[PDB]
């Protein structure tokens, strides 16, 4: 029944600071990601261009290997540290085991590092939540998410950041069992289902499970928005 | 304590150390055209004390003088540190250390003590000077790690009043003797009425080297210099 710190339990059995460091994730930018059957896709919203700089350094989607892709939310500095250590870890896995790195191993590493960082004396928890998408074993698409507690948690689609309940509610109301054309159009529908969907703040990158990361061009996305508006007119 | 910033202001434990410096014994130091003059104000509490034991004006090398306005017990510590550091420079480069490099390294030491979080800062403000490569210098430091460069300055009690006299009295072009004359004038502005051959203690810095004057010539000069 006090305040500090992250070592004390509540009088009713909670940790306040894990829940409170989740709030910075809950109030961050949105990024979604789905898996198709052969091509995986994800992307972030809120490019937030301030009219006078470059943005090639502020990229929220990066990679550790040729098979795996990143995303995050929350604050960006903790993402920078975790990505820096994750590149090293993926390469150290490549040092001993001669496989391409499985996604489950690097997610167990991220969650283990995050939790042994949270257990210790006065170290501030990483207020992020990453999305770790890759397809290695027989080209099987996987995507896992994280938490400041350190719980890797495998999904099939995902929504984080601001208003993630609404965005995940749209993937709920879409998500059909029944092709990279439906997956591209599903990305178009997800980014149209964004919190703002301004049309120019959309940033998406895909991977076809054999290739590397492809950064798209905001004219192809414009025709995607045009065919979404065409289907919306065809609904009437 | 020393680990956390204020809501808006500054580092209160450094401001208090600066106040403890400002509450100290006065001093004055003047950079002239050929030399630098340092002068302190050293009053014994009783008539019992000896004036040959403790020394305010203190050399760092044969051509680098240094006075303070604060506490001797910390002064001697950072003096000894500056001694060892200057002799390490002379080990490395086999050349007498320049005063700017001294002030950099001494400022690094004082800054390292201002870092967190169990040690207190020094309650000592320095006045460093020396004659390196013809042009003499004058460098004041502070407990906060900062440093400056002066033509003439003061530190201690009534440093504001002595400085307003320095702005009026001093100029750009003088010699060492006229510098000593205006220095004993601005120290005599603020000191007690009885100023003798022992209440002051004066060292100079010619280009021929540092020189710490004796009570013989100090009593000869301040025998009603004006």
């Amino acid at each position: 029944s006090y305040d500090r710190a992250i070592t004390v339990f509540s009088p009713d059995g909670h940790l306040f600071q894990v829940e409170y460091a989740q709030e910075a994730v809950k109030k961050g930018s949105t990024a979604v990601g789905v898996r198709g059957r052969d091509i995986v896709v994800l992307g972030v919203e809120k490019k937030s261009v301030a009219k006078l700089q470059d943005e090639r350094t502020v990229r929220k989607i990066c990679a550790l290997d040729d098979n795996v892709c990143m995303a995050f939310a929350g604050l960006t500095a903790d993402a920078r540290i975790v990505i820096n250590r994750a590149r090293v870890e993926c390469q150290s896995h490549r040092l001993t085991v001669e496989d391409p790195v499985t996604v489950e191993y690097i997610t167990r590493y991220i969650a283990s590092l995050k939790q042994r960082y949270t257990q210790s004396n006065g170290r501030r928890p990483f207020g992020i939540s990453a999305l770790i998408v890759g397809f290695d074993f027989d080209g099987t698409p996987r995507l896992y998410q994280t938490d400041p507690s350190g719980t890797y948690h495998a999904w099939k689609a995902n929504a984080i950041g601001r208003g993630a309940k609404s965005v995940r509610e749209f993937l709920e109301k879409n998500y059909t069992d029944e092709t990279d054309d439906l997956t591209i159009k599903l990305v178009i529908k997800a980014l149209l289902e964004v919190v703002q969907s301004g049309g120019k703040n959309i940033e998406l990158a895909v991977m076809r499970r054999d290739q590397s990361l492809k950064i798209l061009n905001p004219e192809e996305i414009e025709k995607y928005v045009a065919e979404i508006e065409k289907e919306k007119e065809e609904n009437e | 304590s020393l680990t956390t910033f204020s809501p808006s202001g500054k580092l209160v434990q450094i401001e208090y150390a600066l106040a403890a410096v400002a509450g100290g014994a006065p001093s004055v130091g003047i950079k002239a055209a050929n030399g630098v003059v340092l002068a302190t104000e050293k009053k014994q509490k009783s008539i019992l004390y000896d004036e040959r034991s403790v020394h305010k004006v203190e050399p760092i090398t044969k051509h680098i003088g240094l006075v303070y306005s604060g506490m001797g017990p910390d002064y001697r510590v950072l003096v000894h540190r500056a001694r060892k550091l200057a002799q390490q420079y002379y080990l490395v480069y086999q050349e007498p250390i320049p005063t700017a490099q001294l002030v950099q390294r001494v400022a690094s030491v004082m800054q390292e003590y201002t870092q967190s979080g169990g040690v207190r800062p020094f309650g000592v403000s320095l006045l460093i000077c020396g004659w390196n490569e013809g042009r003499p210098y004058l460098f004041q430091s502070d407990p906060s790690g900062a440093y400056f460069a002066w033509k003439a300055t003061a530190m201690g009690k009534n440093y504001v009043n002595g400085k307003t006299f320095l702005e009026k009295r001093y100029n750009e072009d003088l010699e060492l003797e006229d510098a000593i004359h205006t220095a004993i004038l601005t120290l005599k502005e603020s000191f007690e009425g009885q100023m003798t051959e022992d209440n002051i203690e004066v060292g100079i810095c010619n280009e021929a080297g540092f020189r710490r004057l004796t009570p013989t010539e100090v009593k000869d000069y301040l025998a009603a210099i004006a």
Binding site: - | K10, E15, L18, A22, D142, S144, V160
Partner: protein, 90 residues
């Protein structure tokens, strides 16, 4: 009350600055039989956004010294402006 539905506008009073301070400099130096022909721009600037009538008060401080050269108003602000003082904290 801070609900705008109770009061619409909310308008602070930005103190006078260089332009305004200089115009009011000439103003508050108008009627006093000063030592005319004097720069008031440095006075306006020495006022760091003084609260309007402070030019009048500096005029009062100046005239008191003369009891009005530019030096009068200089010493006037000197009484006025000191504290701020006390460097050695840069």
């Amino acid at each position: 009350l801070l609900r705008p539905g109770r009061i619409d506008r909310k308008i602070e009073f930005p103190p006078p600055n260089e332009e305004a301070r200089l115009d009011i400099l000439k103003i508050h130096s108008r009627k006093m039989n000063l030592t005319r022909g004097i720069n008031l721009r440095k006075i306006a600037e020495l006022m760091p956004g003084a609260s309007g009538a402070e030019v009048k008060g500096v005029c009062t401080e100046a005239g008191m010294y003369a009891l009005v050269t530019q030096e009068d108003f200089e010493m006037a602000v000197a009484k006025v402006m000191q504290k701020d003082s006390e460097k050695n904290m840069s």
